[PDB]
């Protein structure tokens, strides 16, 4: 039942930095590597006493894979994981798509291909990267089409990021982002959106962090891939596997972009006033204010929802309140589905780390839905793209690295029929 | 469950805290709490603390 | 009266690694039955007793 | 003797093992749950806090 | 000399089963590590239609459990009297259906079904004369419903005079875990009106409400659940293992309750539950037992039979009674309530008596009616069906592996008249022919 | 053997019947835990009428406690002789009806009645020969009023030829309690005249007169009111649950009190009742009984005998007594105000004899008199009804639930022709 | 059983803020939100389940918001003794008040604050499941309890609608007032209260205050002495859902029994006996004399005269050592008395209602500990009179359109300020017309 979660870019890095702390100390294993048989589907008894993650680090850039090999974690990680290139794709991705990423991906395919030897019930892939940056989307992508046309029909998942609508890091972003999902549309087998604005709003309000910095965003990513794999790790009394997710929550091959959120996000002093129960942790995990995406359900219609519950729950609590939430009329179900739900119970509790803002919470949901306001998201993306590639601003460099305008209209096609479809299939 | 079995059917602990509904609905580690709010309020000590 | 009182059974190990030790290690963890232990009671001493 | 009319004081039927007034406990069957006040009758609310995981009803 | 089988299919069928035998195994006097520590000689005389004699009274149970994923074998192996199941009857793969039916029909059941034949026929030639196979499943889980159907269809062709139980929950509205359920249960029926001998339909919905207004449990876990339908279950044994007055075995049961091949739905129900805090207000009587089991709240589906007609009836009865009480309150039953009860079969109801009650208990029932209101279930599946295929819904996790649409069309048209003969048989004119 | 089914509505009904049962249980002689406790064998050989032995000599009444709040519920089961209920029998809503017979008879009944009908079809379906039903009700609230006509209405849709008692109170002009107290009470008796099959009429201002004059006690809290009425529930019934010298069932008070099927009102009275003080001042005589069992002032309701006449009536009797000085006593109190009397019907008076009287007394009597001077309090209503009525005055707390102004203006037509028939055979 | 109270405006959160110390000390929970460990489970407790739910350990928080768009008094709240009781989310706080504008609270500013408050109320009562029906407090005097207190209320109805609305707000004084735009603000919201709170209940601080200086010879009272009465008033009616009691009444009886036309919900209130420390050992406190003084104007909490008006109803609440012969008594001694007559419509005036449990006090205050006390709501006429007296003053500084270049700059035009004219005319016209 084992998972390798492979790690692009500076932002996949940190977010795994931050979920392999909490494995690390979910489980019980110290960073230097020894405990004082959950944890087989992330580490691997190697040697006598020693445990090493299932997992690649790849980047172009040196700065922050060498800074996580002088950390805490020097033991624990082998060495031969941590790939590291020696320049930048910087924010380009035809030069980490043609340039740079080819001398890069072979090493990391062979790497890959050794911790599958050892993977006997190899669950599937599940990916870490985001498409604003260069190394994250450009080289991404062909080690996404290379691992597809390796294996197949392996599941994939992606917790992808996207650029945030009114906020931004860079300027040459939405091409990024367009070149990246021509490819996430068709070789992606689920994604799951995350925006960054909507986990700062989260942490704004719930987590009442006035300046909260990447750590915290990362960390809550790590809360929710922890909760999202403790079926597969720990037990429960109704679990469900990864091939749950794709057989219950993709009505069709072409739509594959999920919604997340997740409650209680609450902190210390908070939890002492808030009755916090089942029913209403459940209610919290549907109001647009604690999603992911900042993205508002109320527009769109749902076609499935997915609820992944830890802690001390029973089927009992669960079913009342799915039955209150089908009854309520604020959120409406498309009409093809008359059964959009799907729950999953598992005994153990979510974790603690040391310096951290979430406080000890003996129930927890996780939720994974699929709704028609990612349609609204991608056109607002496109219409920003198509806003910059009227005036041909930035293209000469794209066309330097070795591709050329063709690329850039066939995308926005593909993302046209996307949209068209999205359309179409919320009526 | 479904693919793991660490904790048996009927594990004392497990069917105490169960069995107790209170529990189920309400459940709090209050110790851990006050240690979370002083962790923060050291935090923003040691922010200011930086600062002068 | 709760239910637990009346619990009988003997239970076993859930899902784990395969043993790949045999029991002739040294190392591998055994049953000593002997020495005797603690009896309780005077004149305890001979098993027909 | 007079017997009190009309709804408030919530009594033997009402109380449940999921509301805004009624103790910690393992219970396994509602009506016995259902009366603590009069099974109880006197104890002090910390030490029901203190059994936390015991029968202490009917 | 009368044999039956118990297989297991999916997590809800290990765990029914572990339940089923954990009471079988208190009721013949057996202990959790499988040697005999009974006390009286009638707990010997009738255990080998459940047991084999391995060595010094080491009587291992005629089971064979199925999955496909191996937390279930782990959780029924790890729990109380898991030391009795033999090893070889987990016939077994390591993948997972993933609430598929077609992964547990056509691509997983195909290569492991073979090792469940093998396990299964010799078992079933492991004795002398075989009175029939009894499996439980689900029909919402893919290697509980697609791999379960796919082996009573085999089970069938190879043994075609054999009985065959089959206690399937079904999936209802109120409670609906997955998405994919009526995908799963049209198919899994269209397979059942053909194969199954027949079906007692259970279904969480009325479980739930059992538990909640009847036994009224705080917490109502699948512990109860389950312990409800394996005391079912006991109670349909009941009569092979001991002796009564009037027996009736399970052959017997079905030709005085199934007029018509394709009319094996039955709804079934339990009688005493009660709670424990109520049990002293209460008469204890045979005429308290019947009046209870004939409730609408006291049956096992989430199917009113107050909205149909009783086509033939059965009660199950255990402990030592009086035939009048019995015979008068049956009669009684019979003759007042004359509107639910079809009039081209007069005396619709069967009894039988046996002489060794479930534990904890003097005397008790169980009740078999094959109405035709249970075809409201069917309809009520049968609405999402179609809806959710008017569009191909989730259609390429089936078609992706080698089905197509003509297998959907031909079990929603099988439903449909599977329901309409029902309808038919329900307002058949009473006095006429053609 | 022949056997009473109890059911309560509201409040008023839920209280009257705890202490009705109370005093039941008191006499058979069964303990607050339910178990038997009597001396001598008679208490045992007539319980079925009223009990069920569940185990053990543990016996529950035979009971329906049904209304719109949990409270009522709570409270019974409070106060003792509160676990000698079965816990199946509280049929319970849980919204609440609030002095509106709209809300009780359409909205809040329609959901309610069909596991009240359930539970009574249950409990007269566990016993075998029942002899009639029994009602404790108010005509002035929401859940007792609308929600108990609708019971009515089902009850004798579903079992016709049984046999009924209605204990029904009515308010008073001079005690009002509600405001809608004569739209709920008009149309419940619309409802009771066609329906019922006899009524007895209370009200508490006569109970709250007796315990002024007779019992002379400071603070008359509602538990004397009810101990009155258990009082006169329980005298009614004597004749099934033990021997007697002359017995006399439910339809047998029927047949001797109803000369035409729509006039079943009567008004009722207890004897015999003084004060503690004066206790052992009196004498224990058939005479001494009489003398107040007919006097106006012991009466339980609102509606003076002296301005009107005595069509028929009824006098039952407990203990073991000569039945030659009850005869010359209703004789000679029917000789004597002949005026008082109806004149095309001879020998007003039904009598009968119990040997078994109540614990505490040796010599008591219960009363039940149809008489027409009954449509006083109902002019007395009807007025209130017609002064309100008449420009819409509260109607949109009615006509907003479903109902329409025809409901009204039936209800009055059938109301004045009731006192019409009624003042006519005066 | 349960009922949720939100409080809106200065005022209301001031209000409040007494209701809720006033509860905390009747069912004994401290003001850090856990009962004191001394305590020993009873009959008796789980009384508090219809205003406190228990969270976590031993922590209860009250069903309640307070929302304001000014944060000073908030801040005060969030800073004052019961800094642990009230849950930090629940005390809803703007960033800029209305400024004693109807048209501002209404339009510019509440627009971004209703939302919330309905986000928590929505999630308060999918915690309760026996919700009886909602109260709000307000001061139609100011800017957001009338601007904003407007839109919530048109919110509430479009969410839940059936749901009872208890609308307490509180008029200026027909005589002694503290603003001067308040006559807009009155008549504005007073348009928006016809036709969605279900109840409404007169308050005005000129009779409080003559209550105070003359019965509980304070002559000096400030705010707080009036927010005490107002919460003893609450109590006093909502001890009927909370105790036991012999015959008792519950938050929709009141619609029944007081309201004979859909139009006309404006309730007069009164309470006795309010009584000092020192009269009240001198005279016997009994139901006669109780019930008497919940009759004069001089014991009336709105500046009206009853003697001018017809008692259209009237209900009765009781507390303590109450036996339902002396109230039923008292009650036909008033039916009898000539010097009050009753519309021709109800000659069944009255309702009673009897409780148990009689009126706590509070340390600090005025009132000392009474074995009985009567709480008075009626209705009559009389608010034709004093809404007729608001309507003269408002025409008047109307007429020369003072202060309208204000409400016109926030947004609004003056066909609004028309409309409620002409309501408000329809009100006193049903007024005179119902009283004939
Ligand atoms: N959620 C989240 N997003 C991040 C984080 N770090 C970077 N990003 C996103 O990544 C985008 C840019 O890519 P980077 O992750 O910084 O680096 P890169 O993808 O390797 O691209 P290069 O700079 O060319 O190497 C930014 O627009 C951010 O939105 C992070 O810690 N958390
Ligand atoms: N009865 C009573 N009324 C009060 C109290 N405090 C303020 N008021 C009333 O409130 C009115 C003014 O409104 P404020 O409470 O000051 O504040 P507001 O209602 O939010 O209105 P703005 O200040 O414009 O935002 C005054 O006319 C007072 O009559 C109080 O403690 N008791
Ligand atoms: N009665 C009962 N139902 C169960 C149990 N376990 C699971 N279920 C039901 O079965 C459904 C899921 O079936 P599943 O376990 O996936 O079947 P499988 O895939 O064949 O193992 C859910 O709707 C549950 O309600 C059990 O122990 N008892
Ligand atoms: N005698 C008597 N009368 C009662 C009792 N309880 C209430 N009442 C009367 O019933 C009337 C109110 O009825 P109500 O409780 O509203 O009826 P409900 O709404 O159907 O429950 C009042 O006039 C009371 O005088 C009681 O216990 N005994
Ligand atoms: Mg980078
Ligand atoms: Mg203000």
Same mark, same amino acid.
């Given at each position: ?16 930095? *931050? ?16 405990? $004082?048989? *959950? ?39 082998? $060495? ?89 890091? *860079? ?92 409650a209680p ?9 808030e009755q916090l129960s089942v029913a209403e942790i459940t209610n919290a995990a549907f109001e647009?204010?604690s ?16 609820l992944?519950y830890?802690g001390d729950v029973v089927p009992k609590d669960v079913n009342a309140s799915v039955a209150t939430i089908k009854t309520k ?12 739900f799907?729950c999953?119970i ?15 919470v003996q129930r927890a949901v996780?939720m994974?839905?699929?709704?028609? *306001? ?54 | ?20 509904a209170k529990?189920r609905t309400i459940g ?25 | ?49 | ?15 449940r093992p999921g509301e805004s ?38 | ?5 118990? &297989? ?65 074998? =782990? ?16 016939? @077994? ?34 004795? =002398?004369?075989?009175?029939? @196979? ?29 009985? +065959? ?10 409670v ?32 739930? =409400? ?9 917490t109502?876990?699948?512990? =109860? ?16 293992? @001991? ?14 309750? &199934? ?7 039955? +709804? ?52 030592? +009674? ?22 081209? &079969? ?20 169980? @009740? ?5 209101? &249970? ?60």
């Amino acid at each position: 039942r084992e998972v390798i979660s492979i790690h692009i870019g500076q932002a996949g890095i940190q977010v795994g930095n *931050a979920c392999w702390e909490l494995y690390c100390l979910e489980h019980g294993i110290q960073p230097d590597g020894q405990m $004082p048989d *959950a944890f087989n589907t992330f580490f691997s008894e190697t040697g006598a006493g020693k445990h090493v993650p299932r997992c690649i680090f790849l980047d172009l850039e040196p700065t922050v894979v060498d800074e996580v090999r002088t950390g805490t974690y020097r033991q624990l990680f082998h $060495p031969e994981q941590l790939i590291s290139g020696k320049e930048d794709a910087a924010n380009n991705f035809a030069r980490g798509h043609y340039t740079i990423g080819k001398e890069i991906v072979d090493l990391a395919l062979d790497r890959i291909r050794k911790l599958a030897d050892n993977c006997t019930g190899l669950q599937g892939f599940l990916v870490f990267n985001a498409v604003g940056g260069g190394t994250g989307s450009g080289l991404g992508s062909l080690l996404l089409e290379r691992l597809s046309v390796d294996y197949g029909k392996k599941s994939k998942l992606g917790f992808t990021v996207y650029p945030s609508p009114q906020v931004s890091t *860079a300027v040459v972003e939405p091409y990024n982002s367009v070149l990246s999902t021509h490819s996430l549309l068709e070789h992606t087998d689920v994604a799951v959106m995350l925006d960054n604005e909507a986990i700062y709003d989260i942490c704004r309000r719930s987590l009442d962090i006035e300046r909260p910095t990447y750590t915290n965003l990362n960390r809550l990513i790590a809360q929710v891939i922890s909760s999202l794999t403790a079926s597969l790790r720990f037990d429960g009394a109704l679990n469900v596997d990864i091939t749950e997710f794709q057989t219950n929550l993709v009505p069709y091959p072409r739509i594959h972009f999920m919604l997340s959120s997740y409650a209680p996000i609450i902190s210390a002093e908070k939890a002492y006033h808030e009755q916090l129960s089942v029913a209403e942790i459940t209610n919290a995990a549907f109001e647009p204010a604690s999603m992911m995406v900042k993205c508002d359900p109320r527009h769109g219609k749902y076609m499935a929802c997915c609820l992944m519950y830890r802690g001390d729950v029973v089927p009992k609590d669960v079913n009342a309140s799915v039955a209150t939430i089908k009854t309520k009329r604020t959120i409406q179900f498309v009409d093809w589905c008359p059964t959009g739900f799907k729950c999953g119970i598992n005994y153990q509790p979510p974790t603690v780390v040391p310096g951290g803002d979430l406080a000890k919470v003996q129930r927890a949901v996780c939720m994974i839905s699929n709704s028609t *306001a990612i349609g609204e998201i991608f056109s607002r993306l496109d219409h920003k793209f198509d806003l910059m590639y009227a005036k041909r601003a930035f293209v000469h460099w794209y066309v330097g690295e070795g591709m050329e305008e063709g690329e850039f209209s066939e995308a926005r096609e593909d993302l046209a029929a996307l949209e068209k479809d999205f359309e179409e299939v919320g009526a | 469950g479904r693919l793991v079995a660490q904790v048996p059917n009927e594990d004392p602990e497990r069917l105490k805290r169960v069995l107790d509904a209170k529990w189920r609905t309400i459940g709090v580690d209050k110790e851990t709490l006050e240690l979370q709010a002083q962790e923060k309020k050291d935090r923003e000590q040691a922010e200011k603390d930086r600062d002068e | 009266m709760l239910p637990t009182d009346t619990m009988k059974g003997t239970f076993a190990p859930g899902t784990t690694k395969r043993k790949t030790v045999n029991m002739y290690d040294t190392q591998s963890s055994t049953f000593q039955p002997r020495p005797e232990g603690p009896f309780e009671a005077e004149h305890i001493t001979d098993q027909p007793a | 003797t007079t017997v009190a009319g009309g709804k408030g004081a919530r009594g033997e039927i009402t109380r449940r093992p999921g509301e805004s007034g009624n103790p910690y406990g393992v219970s396994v069957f509602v009506d016995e749950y259902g009366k603590w006040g009069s099974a109880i009758q006197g104890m002090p609310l910390t030490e029901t806090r203190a059994r936390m995981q015991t029968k202490y009803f009917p | 000399m009368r044999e039956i089988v118990h &297989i297991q299919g999916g997590q809800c069928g290990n765990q029914i089963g572990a339940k089923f035998w954990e009471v079988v195994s208190d009721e013949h006097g057996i202990d959790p590590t499988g040697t005999y520590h009974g006390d009286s000689d009638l707990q010997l005389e009738r255990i080998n239609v459940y047991f084999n004699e391995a060595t010094g009274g080491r009587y291992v149970p005629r089971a064979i459990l199925m999955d496909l994923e191996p937390g279930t074998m =782990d959780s029924v192996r790890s729990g109380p009297y898991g030391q009795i199941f033999r090893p070889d009857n987990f016939v @077994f793969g390591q993948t997972g259906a993933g609430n598929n039916w077609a992964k547990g029909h056509y691509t997983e059941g195909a290569e492991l079904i073979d090792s469940v034949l093998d396990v299964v026929r010799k078992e079933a030639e492991s004795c =002398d004369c075989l009175q029939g @196979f009894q499996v439980c499943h689900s029909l919402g889980g893919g290697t509980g419903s697609g791999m379960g159907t796919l082996l009573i269809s085999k089970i069938r062709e190879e043994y075609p005079d054999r009985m +065959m139980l089959t206690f399937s929950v079904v999936p209802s509205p109120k409670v609906s875990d997955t998405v994919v359920e009526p995908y799963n249960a049209t198919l899994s029926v269209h397979q059942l009106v053909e194969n199954a001998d027949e079906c007692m339909v259970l279904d969480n919905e009325a479980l739930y =409400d059992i538990c909640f207004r009847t036994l009224k449990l705080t917490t109502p876990t699948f512990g =109860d659940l389950n312990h409800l339908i394996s005391a079912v279950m006991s109670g349909i044994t009941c009569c092979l293992r @001991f002796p009564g007055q009037l027996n009736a075995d399970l052959r017997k049961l079905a030709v005085n309750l &199934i007029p018509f091949p394709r009319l094996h739905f039955f +709804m079934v129900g339990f009688t005493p539950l009660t709670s424990r805090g109520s049990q002293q207000y209460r008469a204890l009587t045979v005429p308290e037992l019947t009046q209870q089991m004939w409730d609408a709240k006291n049956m096992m589906c989430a199917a009113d039979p107050r909205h149909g007609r009783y086509l033939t009836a059965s009660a199950l009865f255990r402990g030592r +009674m009086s035939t009048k009480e019995v015979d008068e309150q049956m009669l009684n039953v019979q003759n007042k309530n004359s509107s639910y009860f079809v009039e081209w &079969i007069p005396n619709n109801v069967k009894s039988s008596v046996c002489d060794i009650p479930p534990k904890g208990l003097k005397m008790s029932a169980t @009740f078999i009616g094959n109405s035709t209101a &249970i075809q409201e279930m069917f309809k009520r599946v049968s609405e999402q069906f179609t809806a959710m295929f008017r569009r191909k819904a989730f259609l390429h996790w089936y078609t992706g592996e080698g089905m197509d649409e003509m297998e959907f069309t031909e079990a929603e048209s099988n439903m449909n008249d599977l329901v309409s003969e029902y309808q038919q048989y329900q307002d058949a004119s009473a006095e006429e022919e053609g």
